[PDB]
């Protein structure tokens, strides 16, 4: 089997929950974005570096397009990018917009 940490894995309506359920007590971070999104593209490089530094956190991204509509709504989206933080199969935090600092704090909190 292969390890999912150390990188950013893209998910979709069918593969997001199964991954969350197998996370264990590792916090899961989800970057909800769309194509052609300015603030999303700016955050992208930084998000990948976060995945490289925090090996005890699973980093995912979801393209909030037509196909994934049902899941984006279920998770609650208003504007992109939005970051959801999950633990034990539950959303325990959220950061709306490209707020890097607030994102870091949300992650530290989920860990300890």
CA distances from 74 to 55, 62, 90 (A): 27, 13, 12
Per-domain boundaries in the chain: 1-112
Side by side, which strands form the sheet with 90-96? 8-11, 58-63, 28-33, 82-87, 90-96
Please give the CATH topology (third level) of the domain spanning 1-112.
Answer: Glutaredoxin (3.40.30)
In the residue annotation, 40 being an active-site residue is answered as yes
Which residues in the chain have their C atom more than 2.5 Å from the N of the next written residue, marking a break after them?
A: none
Q: Check 5, 19, 37, 44 and give the catalytic one.
A: 37
Structure tokens belonging to residue 28: 């899961």
Q: Check 23, 32, 40, 75 and give the catalytic one.
A: 40
Q: Is the dihedral of CA 17, 23, 26, 32 positive or negative?
A: negative
Distance of alpha carbon 82 from alpha carbon 47, whole angstroms: 12
CA distances from 102 to 5, 61, 91, 106 (A): 22, 18, 16, 6
Resolution of the entry in angstroms: 1.9
Q: Using the structure block, give the residue that is written with the tokens 């860990």.
A: 111
């Amino acid at each position: 089997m292969e390890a999912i940490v150390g990188k950013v894995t893209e998910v979709n309506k069918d593969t997001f929950w199964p991954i969350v359920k197998a996370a264990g007590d590792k916090p899961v971070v989800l970057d909800m974005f769309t194509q052609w999104c300015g603030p999303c593209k700016a955050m992208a490089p930084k998000y990948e570096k976060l995945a490289e530094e925090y090996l005890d956190v699973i980093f995912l991204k979801l393209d909030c397009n037509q196909e994934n509509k049902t899941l984006a709504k279920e998770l609650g989206i208003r504007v992109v990018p939005t970051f959801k933080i999950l633990k034990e199969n539950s959303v325990v935090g959220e950061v709306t917009g490209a707020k890097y600092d607030k994102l870091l704090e949300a992650i530290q909190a989920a860990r300890s």
